[PDB]
């Protein structure tokens, strides 16, 4: 496919910078959802997926827990859509 | 493979930031080389390979009509 692929799930990048709600809207309109941090943490995909949006609504990082307490909703970040 | 794909070519990301010469050495160790500007300009691959080193010695970009820099380098 036209992007990354892992275990049968294919993620396409979107270069445009948009907030979380717009990213989710675009992913859903494209018959897809934002990447799940659970499946992307350990796998190599993180190297490409860092500082992109996730389902939980926070940028994806390698930290195990303790998500960013400070609000990140009003921010712009590139997004992947499955 | 572990990385991106185009025309039977696998591109692997080495997230470590390094100069052009260290990037060339690392790719040579892998038996691969840096991407060429021609193959990436006309592809979606560009969105991933932008601001990453190329064989020409300058960062890959669509613009324009240095050994002192370090940037994430792919390997094919």
């Amino acid at each position, epitope marked *: 496919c036209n992007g990354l692929y892992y275990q049968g799930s294919c993620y396409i*990048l979107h*270069s445009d*910078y948009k907030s979380f709600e717009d990213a989710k809207a675009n992913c859903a309109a494209e018959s897809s959802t934002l990447p799940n941090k659970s499946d992307v943490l350990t796998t190599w995909l993180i190297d*490409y997926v*860092e*500082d*992109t949006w996730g389902s939980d609504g*926070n*940028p994806i*990082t*390698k*930290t*195990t827990s*303790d998500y*960013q*307490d*400070s*609000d*990140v909703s*009003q*921010e*712009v*970040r*590139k997004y992947f859509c499955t | 493979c572990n990385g991106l794909y185009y025309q039977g070519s696998c591109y692997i990301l080495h997230s*470590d*930031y390094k*100069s052009f010469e260290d990037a060339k050495a690392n790719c040579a160790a892998e038996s691969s080389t840096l991407p060429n500007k021609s193959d990436v300009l006309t592809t979606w691959l560009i*969105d*991933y*390979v*932008e*601001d*990453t080193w190329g064989s020409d010695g300058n*960062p890959i*970009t*669509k*613009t324009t009509s240095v*050994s*002192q*820099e*370090v*940037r*994430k380098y792919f390997c094919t």
Partner: antibody
Amino acid sequence: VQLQESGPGLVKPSGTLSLTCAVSRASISSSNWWSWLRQPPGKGLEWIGEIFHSGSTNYNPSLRSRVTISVDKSKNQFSLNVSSVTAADTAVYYCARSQGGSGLFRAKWFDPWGQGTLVTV
Amino acid sequence: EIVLTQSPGTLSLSPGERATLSCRASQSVSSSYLAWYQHKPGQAPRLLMYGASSRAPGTPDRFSGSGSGTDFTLTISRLEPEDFAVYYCQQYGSSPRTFGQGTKV
């Protein structure tokens, strides 16, 4: 990439402080996120936002409301307006550059800084 | 907002020493992503290291950095009169990029 900061040193409280920086030896349209930072006198530094050639701006949540960063490509100048000053904003504002922005591989660290102008409210 | 604290506020020395500067984080920083800087009074701040263990071009080899998660540290093996100044920690693994307090020499 030589960055030089220029702006009004004195901005009375609650006014808008506009600091403009000039990009030299490179293009503002290039793949670089231009950020503005703050150094309160004697205290630690902060990060008061960033901008790109497309106008996309990402701010610090604490300072999101007050600040507005803009870009003018004709004069290759990326400027920052801080409104509703509370007299706690006195600092040596710095221009900054963060490699990347066109691709997915943005390097956050601000390698080329610029001599910062000190503004006294 | 990860708050970074630099333990030694001032490490006063005369030229020649294995100076060690340390700085800790409230929360773990992803990938040990901490790039130190330099600040000579008035002069434009520089990028001494990125990634907490890599030296950007233009800085000598005497700067060696090590750390992970909470704790990060910079080390100057030997000191020269043109290499003593304020130093900073910069973590870029959190949504708001947070600096650290200066460590004057």
